[PDB]
Design a binder for this molecule. Structure first.
Ligand SMILES: [Mg+2]
Lengths: 132, 86, 120, 108, 101, 122, 99, 195
C-alpha cells in the first residue's frame, strides 16, 4: 500500500487544499512544481546549492511566520530573482505584514546575496478544494 | 498650478515631496482648486489622480469635494469617500 | 568634505521619487548595481588579471636555473607543458609551483649528484 | 562594397530609457513600494506612514542583527559582488599609532 | 548544534583534504615517472606515507547533507534516496517527476 | 572604434515543458520578424533521463520508484546582425527570460586578416 | 612512419603546445595531473557540505531572540520539563553510577 | 484590527493600457486582472477553482506582460541602437569573398546569482582554405602539419583552443596558431628533401 504525502480521507470532515489532494503520480498530469529553476536541466552546474537554498528558505519562511502561510511557498527563480508569492491568512494587521515583508527582504537578500522582492496574495481562511 | 503640476513628476520629480505634508498639501491645494474652479471632467480627474494617486482626502478637502460634487450634481459616490474620510 | 556628503543627502531627499511600475522596480534594481550587466557574458570580473595569451603559452621565461639536454630538463618540459594546458589555475599559481619545483630540486642535491648527471 | 559602421556604445542607462521610460503612469496608482493586493493596501496616509515605517524598522533591526553578528554573512556564493552585501565595522585595528588610531576611532 | 561525529569527521576529512592538495600533488609528481630515478621516488614514498592521516581524498565518503547516510546517495544533488524521494514526492524539485514512461 | 560584426549567432532555449518555450518562440519569432532578424524555428530530438531508487527503506528490493527527467530542445538561428543590434535583441530576450527555460549564446563573429600573416618572417 | 612524420609532429608540438621530445604514457600521467585540478580543491567537493554550523547557530540565536519560533525545541524542552518534573532528571557533574 | 478593501478590478476602467497595468514579468497577483479564467482538475459535480488562491496560476507564468502592442511600442523605442546589415553582404558567397574567417563564441545563463560557466571559454576558429595564398608545397605542408584539424571535404580548417579561460585570449591564440602555421607553410626545411 503506497502512501505518499497524499491525503487519506477518513470522513467528509477534513478541509483539504488543491495541492495536498493530488498524489505525486499526477505531477506531470494534474499539478505544478513548487519551485522552478534550471538547475535540474542538463547541462547546468550548481544544483545541490539550489536545493539546500529552497529547503532552508521554505522551512525558515514557515517557522518565522506563525500560521501565516495558508499553503507552501512559490519560489520562482530567474538568475538574480528569488521571487516570493505566498498565500497568507487574513488575520493580522497589514502594518505587521509589511514589517515582516521588509524583514524577509533584508534577511534573505543579505544572506543569499540576491535581489528579492516579496509578493503576497491574502486569503481570508485556509483555502479549501475538497472535504476529503 | 500648471507649472508646479508639469514640474511635479514628469520632467523632474524633485518637485514632489520631502515630507509627507508636502505631498498632502500640494495635492490638497491643487485638488480643491480643480474641484471648486474647474468643471466636472477635471474634478473626476482629481478623484482619479490626486485623491486616488495619494491617499484619501482631508476634512476640508472632503467638504470641497462634496461642495464641488453638489455643484455638478454627483451625490452617488459620497459614501465611498465618506468611508475614506472616517 | 562632510558638508558635501550632507549636501548629497540633501540631493537624495530632494530627488526622492516613488515607483509606479515593475519597470521602475527594475529601474531601482538596475541602478543599484544588483542584477547582471545585460546582455550577459560570463568573463565579467573574473578575468585572470589581464594576462595575455603568451603569458599562458610561452612559459620559457620561468625556467632559468635548469639544465638544457637531459632527463631532468625533460621532466621540467613535462611540468611546464602540463601547466600550459591547465586553465583552472592562474599564471601566478603556476609560477608558484615552478619555484617549488626549483627549490625542491636544488634542495636535495645529494641524491641528484648521486644520479651521475648534473642538475643546474 | 563593405561599409563598416562604427559602434554605437551604450550602458545600462540606455536600456532604462529604452524599456522602462517608454511606460506610462498608472491611473489608480498607490505608490508601488507597497503591495497591490486588496487586503494590504493603505486607505489613509497614516496607513502608508505606518507601512513604510514598519518596512524601515524591520530594515533597521535587520541591520542591527547583521552588525551584532558580522561572522554570519561572510560566506560568499555570488560572483560579481554587489557591494551592499557586507556589514560595516566600528572597530579599531591600530592602537600604537596616533593619527591612524584617532581617525579609526572617530571617523571609522 | 551538531550531534554526530561520522558526519562531522567526514567534514573534517573534506577540509583537511582541501588543505593537503598541492603538496601531495608535487609528491605524486615525483612518484609517477619513468624518468627521475628510483631513490627520489622512494624518498617521495617515505614523505607521503609520513604525512598525517585525514589528509588524503581516498577517505572521502559522499554522504547526505540531510541525513548523513553513506549509501544510497545521488552525487547529482548530494543527498540520500530517502530525502530526495521525500521532497520529490512533495513536488518541489523542478523537472523531476514520477516516471509514467 | 568600429563594430564587431556577426554572420550568425544563436540562442538555444530549452525547458521542462513545451508550452512555455513554444509561447516564448512565438514571442521571439515576432520580435524577429518585427525587427528584421530573419530566424528559423527548429526542434532537436528530446532527452529523457530516467534513473531509479529504492522504494522501501529496509528491505523490499523488487519494487522500485522511477523518476523521469524530460529535457526538450528549441533553437533559433540569428543571422546577419552587428554587435550593437545583437545587444538589442539579446537584451530583449534576456530582460524577458522566463524562470524555467535555459539560454546558450553562440555568436559567429567576423575578422578580415591576422597581422604578420601577409608576407611574414616571424 | 619515419622522421618526416617525427619532425612534423615535433614542429607541431612546438607549435600547438604539446611536448616536443617523446616520452612515456606513465610520464604523461604527470601532464594530465597537471593539465587539470587536484581532487580536493573543486568547489563541489570541499564545499560539498556548506558550513552547517553557521545555520545551526543562526537558528539557535533567532530562537533565543524570539524572532524564530522553533517548535521542535519548544516540544523538546516541554518533554525535558516533564522529565525533570517527574523526578528523573540529569545527574550532576560528579554524580552517576558511583553514587 | 479588521479592515475590508475591494480590489482595483472594479476600479480600473475598460480602456486602460496594459503596459500601465502589467509592465513586466509578474508573479500574478489576481487583484489587477479583470479576466476571469479558471484552472484546475475539477471535481465531478463541481467547478475548476477560480483565480483566487490559485497556486496553479502562481507557478504557471502569464504572458499578459508581453502585450503585443506594448511589444511594438518597446520595439519602436528600440529603433535607435540599430545598424544595418549592408546590402552587398546578403548572399553568403559574397560574404565569404569579403570575410572568409569566422570566430565562434560561447555564452550561457544559470539559475542563481553565480555567473561562471566552465564550458564558455572555447572559441573555435573556422577558416575555409580556398581564400588563402597557399602554394602547392605550402598547402601540402599545411595539410601534413595540421593533420585531422582540417575538414577535407568542404575545405574548412577548424582549430579549437581552451588552454586559457578567456575568449579573447584563446581567440588571439588561434590567430597566433594560424599565423605560425602560415609562417611554416612557406618554409621548406632541411629534411623535406629527405621525404
Ligand atoms: Mg503498489
Amino acid at each position: 500500500k503506497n502512501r505518499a504525502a497524499r491525503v487519506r480521507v477518513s470522513k467528509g470532515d477534513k478541509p483539504v487544499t488543491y495541492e495536498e489532494a493530488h498524489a505525486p503520480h499526477y505531477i506531470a498530469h494534474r499539478k505544478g512544481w513548487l519551485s522552478l529553476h534550471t538547475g535540474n536541466l542538463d547541462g547546468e552546474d550548481h544544483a545541490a546549492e539550489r536545493t539546500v537554498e529552497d529547503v532552508f528558505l521554505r522551512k525558515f519562511m514557515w517557522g518565522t511566520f506563525p500560521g501565516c502561510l495558508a499553503d507552501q511557498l512559490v519560489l520562482k527563480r530567474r538568475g538574480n530573482q528569488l521571487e516570493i508569492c505566498a498565500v497568507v491568512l487574513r488575520q493580522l494587521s497589514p502594518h505587521k505584514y509589511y514589517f515582516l515583508v521588509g524583514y524577509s527582504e533584508t534577511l534573505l537578500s543579505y544572506f543569499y546575496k540576491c535581489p528579492v522582492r516579496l509578493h503576497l496574495q491574502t486569503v481570508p481562511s485556509k483555502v479549501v478544494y475538497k472535504y476529503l | 498650478a500648471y507649472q508646479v503640476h508639469g514640474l511635479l513628476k514628469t520632467g523632474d520629480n524633485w518637485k514632489f515631496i520631502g515630507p509627507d505634508q508636502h505631498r498632502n498639501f500640494y495635492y490638497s491645494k491643487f485638488f480643491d482648486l480643480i474641484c471648486l474652479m474647474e468643471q466636472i471632467d477635471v474634478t473626476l480627474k482629481w478623484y482619479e489622480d490626486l485623491i486616488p494617486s495619494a491617499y484619501f482626502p482631508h476634512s476640508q478637502t472632503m467638504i470641497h469635494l462634496l461642495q464641488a460634487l453638489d455643484v455638478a450634481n454627483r451625490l452617488e459616490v459620497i459614501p465611498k469617500i465618506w468611508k475614506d474620510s472616517k | 568634505s562632510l558638508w558635501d556628503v550632507e549636501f548629497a543627502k540633501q540631493l537624495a531627499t530632494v530627488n526622492e521619487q516613488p515607483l509606479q511600475n515593475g519597470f521602475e522596480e527594475l529601474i531601482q534594481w538596475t541602478k543599484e548595481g544588483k542584477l547582471w550587466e545585460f546582455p550577459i557574458n560570463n568573463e565579467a570580473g573574473f578575468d585572470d588579471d589581464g594576462s595575455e595569451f603568451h603569458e599562458h603559452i610561452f612559459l620559457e621565461k620561468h625556467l632559468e636555473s635548469f639544465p638544457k639536454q637531459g632527463p631532468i630538463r625533460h621532466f621540467m618540459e613535462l611540468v611546464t607543458c602540463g601547466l600550459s594546458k591547465n586553465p583552472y589555475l592562474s599564471v601566478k599559481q603556476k609560477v608558484e609551483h615552478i619555484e617549488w619545483f626549483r627549490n625542491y630540486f636544488n634542495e636535495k642535491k645529494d641524491i641528484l649528484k648521486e644520479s651521475n648527471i648534473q642538475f643546474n | 562594397e563593405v561599409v563598416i559602421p562604427k559602434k554605437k556604445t551604450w550602458d545600462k542607462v540606455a536600456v532604462l530609457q529604452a524599456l522602462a521610460s517608454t511606460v506610462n503612469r498608472d491611473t489608480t496608482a498607490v505608490p508601488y513600494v507597497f503591495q497591490d493586493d486588496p487586503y494590504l493596501m493603505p486607505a489613509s496616509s497614516l496607513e502608508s506612514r505606518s507601512f513604510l515605517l514598519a518596512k524601515k524598522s524591520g530594515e533597521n533591526v535587520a541591520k542591527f542583527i547583521i552588525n551584532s553578528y558580522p561572522k554570519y554573512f561572510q560566506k560568499d556564493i555570488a560572483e560579481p559582488h554587489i557591494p551592499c552585501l557586507m556589514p560595516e565595522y566600528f572597530e579599531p585595528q591600530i592602537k600604537d599609532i596616533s593619527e591612524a588610531a584617532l581617525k579609526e576611532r572617530i571617523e571609522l | 548544534h551538531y550531534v554526530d561525529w561520522r558526519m562531522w569527521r567526514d567534514v573534517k576529512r573534506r577540509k583537511m583534504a582541501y588543505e593537503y592538495a598541492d603538496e601531495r600533488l608535487r609528491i605524486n609528481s615525483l612518484r609517477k615517472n619513468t624518468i627521475l630515478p628510483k631513490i627520489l621516488q622512494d624518498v617521495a614514498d617515505e614523505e607521503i606515507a609520513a604525512l598525517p592521516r585525514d589528509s588524503c581524498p581516498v577517505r572521502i565518503r559522499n554522504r547526505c547533507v540531510m541525513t548523513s547516510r553513506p549509501r544510497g546517495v545521488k552525487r547529482r544533488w548530494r543527498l540520500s534516496r530517502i530525502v530526495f524521494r521525500h521532497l520529490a514526492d512533495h513536488g518541489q524539485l523542478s523537472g523531476i517527476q514520477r516516471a509514467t514512461w | 572604434e568600429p563594430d564587431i560584426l556577426y554572420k550568425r549567432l544563436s540562442v538555444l532555449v530549452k525547458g521542462h515543458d513545451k508550452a512555455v518555450l513554444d509561447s516564448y518562440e512565438y514571442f521571439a519569432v515576432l520580435a524577429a520578424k518585427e525587427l528584421g532578424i530573419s530566424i528559423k524555428v527548429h526542434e532537436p530530438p528530446r532527452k529523457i533521463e530516467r534513473f531509479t531508487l529504492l522504494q522501501s527503506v529496509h528491505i523490499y528490493k523488487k519494487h522500485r520508484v522511477q523518476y523521469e527527467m524530460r529535457t526538450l530542445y528549441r533553437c533559433l538561428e540569428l543571422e546577419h546582425l552587428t554587435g550593437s543590434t545583437a545587444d538589442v535583441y539579446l537584451e530583449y530576450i534576456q530582460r524577458n527570460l522566463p524562470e524555467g527555460v535555459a539560454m546558450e549564446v553562440t555568436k559567429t563573429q567576423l575578422e578580415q586578416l591576422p597581422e604578420h600573416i601577409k608576407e611574414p618572417i616571424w | 612512419l619515419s622522421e618526416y612524420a617525427f619532425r612534423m609532429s615535433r614542429l607541431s608540438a612546438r607549435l600547438f603546445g604539446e611536448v616536443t621530445r617523446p616520452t612515456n604514457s606513465k610520464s604523461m600521467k604527470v601532464v594530465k595531473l597537471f593539465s587539470e585540478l587536484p581532487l580536493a580543491k573543486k568547489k563541489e567537493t570541499y564545499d560539498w557540505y556548506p558550513n552547517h554550523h553557521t545555520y545551526a547557530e543562526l537558528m539557535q540565536t533567532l530562537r533565543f531572540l524570539g524572532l524564530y519560533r522553533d517548535e521542535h525545541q519548544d516540544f523538546m524542552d516541554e518533554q525535558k520539563r516533564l522529565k525533570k518534573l517527574r523526578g528523573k532528571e540529569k545527574p550532576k557533574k560528579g554524580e552517576g553510577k558511583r553514587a | 484590527r479588521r479592515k475590508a478593501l475591494p480590489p482595483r478590478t472594479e476600479k480600473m476602467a475598460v480602456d486602460q493600457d496594459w503596459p500601465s497595468v502589467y509592465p513586466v514579468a509578474a508573479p500574478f497577483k489576481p487583484s489587477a486582472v479583470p479576466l476571469p479564467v479558471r484552472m484546475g482538475y475539477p471535481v465531478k459535480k463541481g467547478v475548476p477553482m477560480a483565480k483566487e488562491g490559485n497556486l496553479e496560476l502562481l507557478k504557471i507564468p502569464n504572458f499578459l506582460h508581453l502585450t503585443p502592442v506594448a511589444i511594438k511600442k518597446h520595439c519602436e523605442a528600440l529603433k535607435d541602437f540599430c545598424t544595418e546589415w549592408p546590402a552587398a553582404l546578403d548572399s553568403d558567397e559574397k560574404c565569404e569573398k569579403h570575410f572568409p574567417i569566422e570566430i565562434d563564441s560561447t555564452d550561457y545563463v544559470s539559475s542563481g546569482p553565480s555567473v561562471r560557466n566552465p564550458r564558455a571559454r572555447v572559441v573555435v576558429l573556422r577558416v575555409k582554405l580556398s581564400s588563402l595564398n597557399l602554394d602547392d608545397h605550402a598547402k601540402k605542408k599545411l595539410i601534413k602539419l595540421v593533420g585531422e584539424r582540417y575538414c577535407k571535404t568542404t575545405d574548412v580548417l577548424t582549430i579549437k583552443t581552451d588552454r586559457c579561460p578567456l575568449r579573447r585570449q584563446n581567440y588571439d591564440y588561434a590567430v597566433y596558431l594560424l599565423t605560425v602555421l602560415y609562417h611554416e607553410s612557406w618554409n621548406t626545411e632541411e629534411w623535406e628533401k629527405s621525404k
